[PDB]
Symmetry: C3
Subunit: 118 residues, 3 copies
């Protein structure tokens, strides 16, 4: 599929708790997992959010992975283990307090560089 | 299917959001969707640079992602509920609120190292 | 249908977002989509922690959700428009912008206590 993918993390954990290296690690790990070049992976981390999961304000995250292709039942299970693992290790968020929404984007529906990936 | 998540982005000030608002959203959404509250997630983002129709009046852009429980009649019910809460608690007119509803396939929601498929 | 909404998330600092940018996006999107500006919502989020291709140079991740007016040719036109505006006003290179396009079903957009069904 065309090369783009993007991963967003929204979390209540504080800015101070995001490791140096985290966005770079997300980029490299997602490139590897999706088979996409890192040049076309975008990552976005949003700490300090007002959020709750199950009515509790213990650490949690709501995430999205938008990808042109490379989305499906088995792949998404694999991404979830990878990404929950990174959020647990790096941000100290329990995997049972993380949702990740997966979106398979059509290339014609991803704009870039004044045009689209179609 | 257990999961649902509601996100509100708004231009109203942080100081205007009541202390119990996340808990109220959780409880109200659990009742509206029939899902246990244990698996409802909520997220409120105030102080945003955002306009509705070019105007700086209070407004909101929201999303409700749910595995199931999404459809024409249900979404109407959720809009009345959620616009009502945003009006009552955040003083946002319902005609300056959009809510995008997403019926998520269970295979497309990750949680706890796996997906809901 | 009247509704559309445009969201920009960017790592450019808040002080670099010019006065009047939300209004310009509203007017330009209204012209491009044929929708009245009164039902276009825009949302800009500066100072984000982002990387694009591993780099923290200026970049943006954006969404355009619209009832209708979404398709291959229209999206290419919107990308030229919106990348143009982000370059002109926020000094972001077009090759560091993604815009996700979503054609929303009217029944899945809540507004004013109901939906657009
Ligand atoms: Cl509850
Ligand atoms: Cl530029």
């Amino acid at each position: 599929p065309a090369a783009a993918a993007m991963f967003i993390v929204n979390t209540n954990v504080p800015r101070a708790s995001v490791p140096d290296g985290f966005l770079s690690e997300l980029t490299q790990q997602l490139a590897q997992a999706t088979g996409k070049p890192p040049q076309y992976i975008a990552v976005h981390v949003v700490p300090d959010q007002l959020m709750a999961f199950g009515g509790s304000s213990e650490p949690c995250a709501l995430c999205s992975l938008h990808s042109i292709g490379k989305i499906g039942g088995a792949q998404n299970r694999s991404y979830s283990k990878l990404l929950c693992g990174l959020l647990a290790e790096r941000l100290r968020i329990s995997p049972d307090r993380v949702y990740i929404n997966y979106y398979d984007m059509n290339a014609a529906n991803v704009g870039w560089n004044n045009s689209t990936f179609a």
